[PDB]
Write an enzyme that holds these catalytic residues in place. Structure first.
Site, PDB file in Angstrom:
ATOM      1  N   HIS A   3       0.799  -1.251   0.000  1.00 19.29           N
ATOM      2  CA  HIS A   3       0.000   0.000   0.000  1.00 19.29           C
ATOM      3  C   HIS A   3       0.823   1.288   0.000  1.00 19.29           C
ATOM      4  O   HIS A   3       0.310   2.354  -0.330  1.00 19.29           O
ATOM      5  CB  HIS A   3      -0.933  -0.006   1.202  1.00 19.29           C
ATOM      6  CG  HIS A   3      -1.748  -1.252   1.300  1.00 19.29           C
ATOM      7  ND1 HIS A   3      -1.455  -2.264   2.189  1.00 19.29           N
ATOM      8  CD2 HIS A   3      -2.787  -1.694   0.552  1.00 19.29           C
ATOM      9  CE1 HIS A   3      -2.314  -3.254   2.030  1.00 19.29           C
ATOM     10  NE2 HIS A   3      -3.130  -2.936   1.039  1.00 19.29           N
ATOM     11  N   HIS A  48       6.643   6.626   6.056  1.00 16.60           N
ATOM     12  CA  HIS A  48       6.126   6.220   4.744  1.00 16.60           C
ATOM     13  C   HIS A  48       5.461   7.445   4.104  1.00 16.60           C
ATOM     14  O   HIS A  48       5.373   8.507   4.720  1.00 16.60           O
ATOM     15  CB  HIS A  48       5.093   5.093   4.883  1.00 16.60           C
ATOM     16  CG  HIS A  48       3.896   5.492   5.667  1.00 16.60           C
ATOM     17  ND1 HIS A  48       3.843   5.396   7.048  1.00 16.60           N
ATOM     18  CD2 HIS A  48       2.740   6.099   5.284  1.00 16.60           C
ATOM     19  CE1 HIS A  48       2.677   5.863   7.469  1.00 16.60           C
ATOM     20  NE2 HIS A  48       2.007   6.309   6.428  1.00 16.60           N
ATOM     21  N   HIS A 100       2.216   9.038   1.335  1.00 19.79           N
ATOM     22  CA  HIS A 100       1.084   8.936   0.424  1.00 19.79           C
ATOM     23  C   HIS A 100       1.241   9.909  -0.737  1.00 19.79           C
ATOM     24  O   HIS A 100       1.779  10.982  -0.554  1.00 19.79           O
ATOM     25  CB  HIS A 100      -0.238   9.170   1.159  1.00 19.79           C
ATOM     26  CG  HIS A 100      -0.386   8.347   2.404  1.00 19.79           C
ATOM     27  ND1 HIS A 100      -1.235   7.263   2.486  1.00 19.79           N
ATOM     28  CD2 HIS A 100       0.209   8.458   3.619  1.00 19.79           C
ATOM     29  CE1 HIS A 100      -1.139   6.735   3.695  1.00 19.79           C
ATOM     30  NE2 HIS A 100      -0.284   7.452   4.406  1.00 19.79           N
ATOM     31  N   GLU A 110      -3.005  13.584   2.113  1.00 19.59           N
ATOM     32  CA  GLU A 110      -4.161  13.130   2.901  1.00 19.59           C
ATOM     33  C   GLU A 110      -4.800  14.327   3.612  1.00 19.59           C
ATOM     34  O   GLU A 110      -5.987  14.657   3.378  1.00 19.59           O
ATOM     35  CB  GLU A 110      -3.777  11.999   3.844  1.00 19.59           C
ATOM     36  CG  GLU A 110      -3.270  10.765   3.071  1.00 19.59           C
ATOM     37  CD  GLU A 110      -3.488   9.470   3.804  1.00 19.59           C
ATOM     38  OE1 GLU A 110      -3.000   9.363   4.936  1.00 19.59           O
ATOM     39  OE2 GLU A 110      -4.145   8.557   3.264  1.00 19.59           O
ATOM     40  N   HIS A 145       4.556  10.655   6.541  1.00 15.31           N
ATOM     41  CA  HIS A 145       4.122  10.329   7.872  1.00 15.31           C
ATOM     42  C   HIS A 145       5.239   9.653   8.680  1.00 15.31           C
ATOM     43  O   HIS A 145       5.637   8.566   8.310  1.00 15.31           O
ATOM     44  CB  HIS A 145       2.954   9.371   7.782  1.00 15.31           C
ATOM     45  CG  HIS A 145       1.694  10.026   7.292  1.00 15.31           C
ATOM     46  ND1 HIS A 145       0.605   9.313   6.856  1.00 15.31           N
ATOM     47  CD2 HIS A 145       1.361  11.338   7.189  1.00 15.31           C
ATOM     48  CE1 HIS A 145      -0.346  10.164   6.469  1.00 15.31           C
ATOM     49  NE2 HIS A 145       0.080  11.403   6.685  1.00 15.31           N
ATOM     50  N   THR A 194      -4.857   6.449   9.092  1.00 14.34           N
ATOM     51  CA  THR A 194      -5.527   6.720   7.828  1.00 14.34           C
ATOM     52  C   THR A 194      -5.691   5.502   6.880  1.00 14.34           C
ATOM     53  O   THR A 194      -6.193   5.666   5.755  1.00 14.34           O
ATOM     54  CB  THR A 194      -4.873   7.856   7.018  1.00 14.34           C
ATOM     55  OG1 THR A 194      -3.622   7.400   6.493  1.00 14.34           O
ATOM     56  CG2 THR A 194      -4.720   9.123   7.881  1.00 14.34           C
ATOM     57  N   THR A 195      -5.234   4.330   7.311  1.00 19.12           N
ATOM     58  CA  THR A 195      -5.451   3.078   6.588  1.00 19.12           C
ATOM     59  C   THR A 195      -6.050   2.151   7.619  1.00 19.12           C
ATOM     60  O   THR A 195      -5.884   2.363   8.823  1.00 19.12           O
ATOM     61  CB  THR A 195      -4.158   2.438   6.040  1.00 19.12           C
ATOM     62  OG1 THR A 195      -3.286   2.128   7.130  1.00 19.12           O
ATOM     63  CG2 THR A 195      -3.422   3.358   5.106  1.00 19.12           C
TER      64      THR A 195
HETATM   65  N1  LIG Z   1      -1.029   6.562   7.518  1.00 21.93           N
HETATM   66  S1  LIG Z   1      -0.825   6.526   9.105  1.00 21.93           S
HETATM   67  O1  LIG Z   1      -2.036   6.874   9.785  1.00 21.93           O
HETATM   68  O2  LIG Z   1       0.359   7.285   9.424  1.00 21.93           O
HETATM   69  C1  LIG Z   1      -0.531   4.856   9.570  1.00 21.93           C
HETATM   70  C2  LIG Z   1       0.514   4.552  10.426  1.00 21.93           C
HETATM   71  C3  LIG Z   1       0.699   3.247  10.821  1.00 21.93           C
HETATM   72  C4  LIG Z   1      -0.143   2.239  10.368  1.00 21.93           C
HETATM   73  C5  LIG Z   1       0.113   0.834  10.827  1.00 21.93           C
HETATM   74  O3  LIG Z   1       0.938   0.608  11.718  1.00 21.93           O
HETATM   75  N2  LIG Z   1      -0.607  -0.138  10.260  1.00 21.93           N
HETATM   76  C6  LIG Z   1      -0.674  -1.482  10.816  1.00 21.93           C
HETATM   77  C7  LIG Z   1      -1.305  -1.488  12.197  1.00 21.93           C
HETATM   78  C8  LIG Z   1      -1.075  -2.790  12.885  1.00 21.93           C
HETATM   79  C9  LIG Z   1      -1.389  -4.046  12.476  1.00 21.93           C
HETATM   80  N3  LIG Z   1      -0.922  -4.881  13.459  1.00 21.93           N
HETATM   81  C10 LIG Z   1      -0.360  -4.120  14.402  1.00 21.93           C
HETATM   82  N4  LIG Z   1      -0.426  -2.837  14.103  1.00 21.93           N
HETATM   83  C11 LIG Z   1      -1.183   2.564   9.502  1.00 21.93           C
HETATM   84  C12 LIG Z   1      -1.383   3.867   9.110  1.00 21.93           C
HETATM   85 CU   LIG Z   2      -4.354  -3.658  -0.941  1.00 21.93          CU
HETATM   86 ZN   LIG Z   3       0.259   7.392   6.392  1.00 21.92          ZN
END
Ligand SMILES: NS(=O)(=O)c1ccc(C(=O)NCCc2c[nH]cn2)cc1
Ligand SMILES: [Cu+2]
Ligand SMILES: [Zn+2]
Ligand SMILES: [Cu+2]
Length: 258
Positions: free
Chosen positions: A62, A92, A94, A104, A117, A196-197
């Site tokens: 992603h 990372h 977007h 975003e 981010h 945000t994901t």
């Molecule tokens: N775009 S953002 O809001 O900065 C953002 C930052 C981190 C994550 C993330 O860590 N996703 C996996 C979460 C997870 C699964 N298993 C344990 N933690 C997603 C979005």
């Molecule tokens: Cu996907």
């Molecule tokens: Zn992000």
């Protein structure tokens, strides 16, 4: 796995898989600068990144993440709107399918080309996963990328993308200073929000820097060469991976120093 940014797995459907998608503290949001509140309790941000240890860069299907060693207090975020200590775990980006969109967060409805981010977690909670499930668990610093001059610090990141073209690929990425992707002034907006994901958890204190960093149009082409798919699967180019602005609902955006 059935979420993404495509025709049949897009953000508009994520609420069917993650109901908190329609919650009270979703991210990102539009920042209406005329409505921003001044709070003397807010402090300058302390981004203590001197001894940061980058490990590897990974395509997760992603976006791509630069991963940091967060086993100790090596690169931390303190002060700003926060209480206590938050360790940097990864950064990372977007971006969108053309230069006029991709961020975003938006500022008075204006969209930048991309958004960085820097993800941190509250050491109060022992580990990132525990922290991700608490309202004061995470802090994400957002930095806008504004199309303009090429960014040489960013180029070091972009030079690695050919090694991680498809989902699950990773590459050694040592000695990258995440401070090199910060702007010169650290003025910020802050509000309580979410990942945000998926899983879209409402655990994030957002810190959106007012001042963007630069990126060339040429550099933006490079983000778009990545693949959402794994090697062997039908090619799906990573042309856009941003979630649109969500309803602010009750929330207050505060600004530092105003
Ligand atoms: N775009 S953002 O809001 O900065 C953002 C930052 C981190 C994550 C993330 O860590 N996703 C996996 C979460 C997870 C699964 N298993 C344990 N933690 C997603 C979005
Ligand atoms: Cu996907
Ligand atoms: Zn992000
Ligand atoms: Cu789905």
């Amino acid at each position: 796995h059935h979420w993404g940014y495509g025709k049949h797995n897009g953000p508009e459907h994520w609420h069917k898989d993650f109901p908190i998608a329609n919650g009270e503290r979703q991210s990102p949001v539009d920042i209406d600068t005329k409505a921003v509140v001044q709070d003397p309790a807010l402090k300058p941000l302390a981004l203590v990144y001197g001894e940061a240890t980058s490990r590897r860069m990974v395509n997760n299907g992603h976006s791509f993440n630069v991963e940091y060693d967060d086993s100790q207090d090596k690169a931390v975020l303190k002060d700003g709107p926060l209480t206590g200590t938050y360790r940097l775990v990864q950064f990372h980006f977007h971006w969108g399918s053309s230069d006029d969109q991709g961020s975003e967060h938006t500022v008075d409805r204006k969209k930048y080309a991309a958004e960085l981010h820097l993800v941190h977690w509250n050491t109060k909670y022992g580990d990132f996963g525990t922290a991700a499930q608490q309202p004061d668990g995470l802090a994400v610093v957002g930095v806008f990328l504004k199309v303009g001059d090429a960014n040489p610090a960013l180029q070091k990141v972009l030079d690695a993308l050919d090694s991680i073209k498809t989902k699950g690929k990773s590459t050694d990425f040592p000695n990258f200073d995440p401070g090199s992707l910060l702007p010169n002034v650290l003025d910020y907006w802050t509000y309580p929000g979410s990942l945000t994901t998926p899983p879209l958890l409402e655990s994030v204190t957002w810190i959106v820097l007012k001042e963007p960093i630069s990126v060339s149009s040429q550099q933006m082409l490079k983000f778009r060469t990545l693949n959402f798919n794994a090697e062997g699967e039908p090619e799906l180019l990573m042309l856009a991976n941003w979630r649109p602005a969500q309803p602010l609902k009750n929330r207050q955006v505060r600004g530092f120093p105003k």
